[PDB]
Every structure is written in C-alpha cells, then in structure tokens.
Write a protein that binds this ligand. Structure first.
Ligand code: HEC
Ligand SMILES: [Ca+2]
Ligand SMILES: [Ca+2]
Ligand SMILES: [Ca+2]
Ligand SMILES: [Ca+2]
Length: 106
C-alpha cells in the first residue's frame, strides 16, 4: 500500500514505542510495523526500476524485510510478556535493519 506510507508507518511507530507508557501501546505499534513490513516487502523501490523479480537486488530487497519481521516478532514476544523496557530496547535495535537496506536501495 505505497512504499512511502509503509515506511512512514515503521518510522512513526518507532516514536510511539520510545514514548510509550504500557506494553499494550507498544504491542499495538509493533503490530502496525509488522504489517507495514510485509506490505512494503511486496513493492519495488524507485532504484529497482526495471529489475526482474528474480534479480539479486529484488531478492535482497525482499530478504531485508524478512530479517526485520523476525526481529519484530522477537520484540513482540517481550510485549505480550509485559516486558516493556526490554521491548522498548529491542525496538531500538531495529535501526540496524533500517540502515542496511537504505544504504543499498534508497
Ligand atoms: C528495505 C528492505 C528497507 C528496510 C528494512 C527499511 N527501509 Fe525505509 N525505505 C526503504 C526505501 C527503498 C525507501 C525509499 C522510498 C521512496 O519513496 O524513495 C525508504 C524510505 C524510508 C523513509 C522515508 C519515507 C518518506 O517519507 O519518503 C523512512 C522514514 C523510512 N524508510 C523508515 C524506515 C525505518 C524506521 C525502518 C526500520 C524500522 C526502515 N525504513 C526499514 C527501504 C527500507
Ligand atoms: Ca512517493
Ligand atoms: Ca513522506
Ligand atoms: Ca502517508
Ligand atoms: Ca510524519
């Protein structure tokens, strides 16, 4: 549903997470993020123009959303187990996924 908007959704919900008060909020943000990541994973960034879905760049692109959903799952667990700050920290550790893709395909 538009790659810009998917990316806005991940960004945004990182902020709510840092600012959050209780796991239920954090739980909801990570939900939004996960869906965003799966939707984004289906799109074609401008730099990957006329690259066939079997190209390494488009494989690598889709791959990058896979590691990230993993780490979002791994953080959601902490959420459902009431463990806020540790999930608020796991969330921070997600910026490792953000940087790597961007530097390649933004
Ligand atoms: C590739 C597998 C990506 C990962 C993982 C993340 N981002 Fe991304 N982002 C990606 C691309 C290819 C682009 C450019 C889209 C375009 O319109 O050119 C972006 C852009 C953003 C932006 C800017 C959005 C805007 O208003 O134009 C933001 C704020 C952003 N991305 C955030 C973001 C965060 C917070 C991520 C980790 C949780 C993250 N992205 C991962 C590609 C990829
Ligand atoms: Ca746009
Ligand atoms: Ca924008
Ligand atoms: Ca928008
Ligand atoms: Ca905004």
């Amino acid at each position: 549903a538009d790659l810009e908007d998917n990316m806005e959704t991940l960004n945004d919900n990182l902020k709510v997470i840092e600012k959050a008060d209780n796991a239920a909020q954090v739980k909801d943000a990570l939900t939004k993020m996960r869906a965003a990541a799966l939707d984004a994973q289906k799109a074609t960034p401008p730099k990957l123009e006329d690259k066939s879905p079997d190209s390494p760049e488009m494989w690598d692109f889709r791959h990058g959303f896979d590691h990230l959903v993993g780490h979002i799952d791994d953080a959601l667990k902490l959420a459902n187990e009431g463990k806020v700050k540790e999930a608020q920290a796991a969330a921070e550790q997600l910026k490792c996924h953000c940087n790597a893709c961007h530097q390649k395909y933004r």
